[PDB]
Amino acid sequence: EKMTIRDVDLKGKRVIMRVDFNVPVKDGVVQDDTRIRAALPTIKYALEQGAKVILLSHLGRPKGEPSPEFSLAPVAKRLSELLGKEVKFVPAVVGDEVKKAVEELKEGEVLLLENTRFHPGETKNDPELAKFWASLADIHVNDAFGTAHRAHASNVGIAQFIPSVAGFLMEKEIKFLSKVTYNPEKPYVVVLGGAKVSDKIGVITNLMEKADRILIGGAMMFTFLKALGKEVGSSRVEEDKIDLAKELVEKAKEKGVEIVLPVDAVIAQKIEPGVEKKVVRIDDGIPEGWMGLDIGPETIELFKQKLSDAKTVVWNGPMGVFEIDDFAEGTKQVALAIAALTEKGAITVVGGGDSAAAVNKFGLEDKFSHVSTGGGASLEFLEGKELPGIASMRIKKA
């Protein structure tokens, strides 16, 4: 049990809060505000306790220098709308401009700083950056579960200078995942998909230690499929990870862990709605020209079968390009198959930005045991070791 924002006196204090506002933005408008809304409880609570609140967050992965497209300005506007209260935005991470703003902050006021990653020290956990930030406040609140797997200046760095306590989101996430992390009822099935291959493939070696079956879909299926010889065609494959994929399929066998790959795919030459799609089999090969964009009808049946008896399901990654209705069936049917197990008593967890968006799109949000956008953080949590952004928080004592 970590100390939470509830275990400290906030009245009159300056609280620097690390939140995960790493949301999708298009033309200066937040496309998906799930992460912002998830953080609201914590923010509203601090404001009512009469604290002066400073928010810190990253957005994307800037080179370590400013880029208008990665600015947190659109997020401050959205937060203001959601909160129903003006949010002050300072387009700076360090400096007099930042000191001045924090200085003129009244009780029950919120200030959001610019993208933490515009500073090179952030991802390096630079002690000088962390010290400056710690100097602006009395307490540090870590509510950024989605970034808990990263040891950065804003979430881990600052904690070594001032007390660091958990916010409500961070609390809820840990409370839930801990059940599944230590005592997972079997069969425990993991479902991986999505396009962010290079980031997820590494968790497989560890997940392989506690899971019974691992179903792979999304674009990830092709790095594994190609590793097995198969003609992927035009499909997205992560060249630099093929050799690892080969070692993982091999190791899974030696360890009695079943890795289920797709048998058929819905392909199409273009990635736009309404076009002509043809369901092909992988053994038959995907002709250079057609790209795999969703798991086919056969795989949907296979995955359903392999899921039918699961007592614990962890899902991260859309099965196909669910954004375009033409290639969303794999995702919908899998989501439906998993939501059904929940009613039958299985513990079901959805983690990942688009996966959460996917369940929302189908009206399934309340059909799973737990839904999270902290996609990478949750997969790593399941591995058992304490995450750096969780370890940095004060233990609750007496």
Ligand X SMILES: Nc1ncnc2c1ncn2[C@@H]1O[C@H](COP(=O)(O)OP(=O)(O)NP(=O)(O)O)[C@@H](O)[C@H]1O
Alpha-carbon gap, residue 393 to 323, rounded angstroms: 38
Under rule CB under 6 A, how many of the chain's residues touch ligand X? 22
Q: Shortest CA distance to 138 belongs to which of 57, 51, 19?
A: 51
Q: How far is the CB of 372 from ligand X (least distance, A)?
A: 9
* Residue 198 assigned as binding residue: no
Q: Tell me 195's DSSP state.
A: S
DSSP assignment of 22-45 equals: ---EETTEES--HHHHHHHHHHHH
Binding mask 360-379 for ligand X (x = CB under 6 A): ---------------xx---
Alpha-carbon gap, residue 42 to 171, rounded angstroms: 10
Alpha-carbon gap, residue 58 to 89, rounded angstroms: 14
* Interface region with Mg ion, contact rule CB under 5 A, candidates 275-283, 339-347, 351-359, 361-369: 351-359
- Nearer to ligand X by C-beta: 299 or 342? 299
Q: Which does 318 bind (CB under 5 to 8 A by kind): ligand X, Mg ion, none?
A: ligand X
Alpha-carbon gap, residue 132 to 135, rounded angstroms: 5
Residue 355 vs residues 145, 315, 376: alpha-carbon distances, Å:
16, 8, 12
- As beta bridge partners, residue 213 has 189, 258
* Residue 370 assigned as binding residue: no
* Residue 7 assigned as binding residue: no
Burial class (CB in 10 A: 0-12, 13-18, 19+), 288: exposed
Sheet with strand 188-192: strands edge to edge = 258-260, 213-216, 188-192, 312-316, 347-351, 370-372
Q: How far is the CB of 380 from Mg ion (least distance, A)?
A: 14
DSSP assignment of 330-373 equals: HHHHHHHHHHHHHHTT-EEEEESHHHHHHHHHTT-GGGSSEEES
Alpha-carbon gap, residue 190 to 213, rounded angstroms: 6
Which of residues 74, 121, 194, 296 is near ligand X by CB under 6 A? Answer: 194
* Residues in the chain, overall count: 398
* Interface region with ligand X, contact rule CB under 6 A, candidates 57-65, 158-166, 250-258, 317-325: 317-325
* Interface region with ligand X, contact rule CB under 6 A, candidates 12-20, 75-83, 241-249, 312-320: 312-320
Query: Counting contacts by CB under 6 A, is residue 233 touching ligand X?
Result: no
Q: How far is the CB of 112 from ligand X (least distance, A)?
A: 22
* Catalytic one of 35, 78, 241, 367: 35
By beta-carbon distance, which residue lies closest to ligand X? 375
* Catalytic one of 121, 353, 374, 375: 353
Q: Shortest CA distance to 87 belongs to which of 39, 27, 143?
A: 39
* Residue 325 assigned as binding residue: no
Query: Counting contacts by CB under 6 A, is residue 71 touching ligand X?
Result: no
73 CA to centre of own chain: 22
What pairing do the DSSP bridges indicate for beta strands 29-30 and 25-26?
A: antiparallel
Q: How far is the CB of 317 from ligand X (least distance, A)?
A: 5
- Nearer to Mg ion by C-beta: 113 or 377? 377
Residues with Cβ within 8 Å of residue 393, at least 6 apart in sequence: 2, 3, 142, 159, 164, 165, 166, 170
Active-site residue flag, 236? no
* Residue 20 assigned as binding residue: yes
* Residue 355 assigned as binding residue: yes
* Residue 150 assigned as binding residue: yes
- Nearer to ligand X by C-beta: 187 or 353? 353
* Interface region with ligand X, contact rule CB under 6 A, candidates 4-12, 201-209, 252-260, 321-329: 321-329
* Residue 292 assigned as binding residue: yes
* Catalytic one of 196, 241, 306, 332: 196
- Nearer to ligand X by C-beta: 233 or 353? 353
* Interface region with Mg ion, contact rule CB under 5 A, candidates 28-36, 52-60, 323-331, 345-353: 345-353
Q: Which residues are annotated as a binding site?
A: 20-22, 35, 58-61, 117, 150, 200, 292, 316, 323, 352-355
Q: Under the rule (CB under 6 A), what is the footprint of ligand X? A: 193-196, 218-219, 236, 292-293, 316-318, 320-323, 352-355, 375-376
The annotated binding site for ATP is made up of 200, 292, 316, 323, 352-355
Interface residues with Mg ion (CB under 5 A) are 353
